[PDB]
Structure 1
């Protein structure tokens, strides 16, 4: 008797409203969904999670002083190319990247965790262009 290996299925599409929620605690629940670990047939080597669509990314909230004290970083590879972007400036200019960069950092590294992140669809504002998919709503 060997362990069950699921023959493929079509991925389930899911909608989540990031309105008012806390950044890390939503990024947690998206990751789990992205892995597909909420499914009882979860396999670690296959992308069989859920397609997680986010809306109202701009409306996501953070405790403490993290609005202006948390600083994101990019290294251009050139001398002095360490960019410093405080969260305030991030949401001001590219707000969807905040949850995106939080969901990604909580996804496993490797080829799969890079495809699993591609199943993330973050948007600011309540509309998302994924109507053809019939996304369930999740209250999380």
Structure 2
């Protein structure tokens, strides 16, 4: 027989809710990336999104070690000459705290259309409330 392949039509994706409070950024992000990709399922298929939907609460309370809170720098370029911009981790937390988790996870997901599709299943919130009661997310301790 040919090896099994997951089918995008029939894949079951569960909903989970994770609390980022006090969790180390990168060690949370690897577990998120793993589960968004579906690497935790026996039906894992490289060309199919078999992963789960994950709500992350309290993104503003994510932890980092060392002097990273002040010294970790996020760079981006605007596309305009001289348009190199930067923000420290602490500035990112103050202004756009959900982006810290989102940026970390995006860099750990595959690049290309499927990786972008996998990222859409991550729902990051700054505080302790989400609006997805209807999806009945299960608590997941990462």
Q: TM-score range, shorter-chain basis?
A: over 0.9
- Ranges of 4+ aligned residues in structure 1 off by more than 2 Å: none
**Number of paired residues?**
140
The C-alpha deviation readout for 1:35-57, integer Å capped at 9, x for no partner, is: 00101111111112000110000
Please name the residue that 1:9 is paired with: 11
Offset at residue 139 of structure 1 (A)? 1.1
Paired with 1:66 and 1:101, the residues of 2 have a C-alpha distance of 15
Please name the residue that 1:43 is paired with: 45
The C-alpha deviation readout for 1:88-120, integer Å capped at 9, x for no partner, is: 100000001001100001001000000101111
| Aligned partner of residue 128 in structure 1, secondary structure | coil
Offset at residue 10 of structure 1 (A)? 3.4
Query: Which of 78, 81, 101 is equivalent to 2:80?
Result: 78
Q: Which moved more, 1:8-17 or 1:77-86?
A: 8-17
Consecutive unaligned residues in structure 1, runs of 5 or more: none
| Aligned partner of residue 105 in structure 1, secondary structure | helix
- For the 8 Å contact 2:30–2:105, the answer to whether it is kept is yes
Residues 1:123 and 2:125 are matched in the alignment = yes
Please name the residue that 2:140 is paired with: 138
| Aligned partner of residue 17 in structure 2, secondary structure | strand
Instruction: Report the aligned-residue RMSD.
Output: 0.9
Please name the residue that 2:106 is paired with: 104
Give me the TM-score of the superposition, normalised by structure 1: 0.97
Consecutive unaligned residues in structure 2, runs of 5 or more: none
Give me the TM-score of the superposition, normalised by structure 2: 0.95
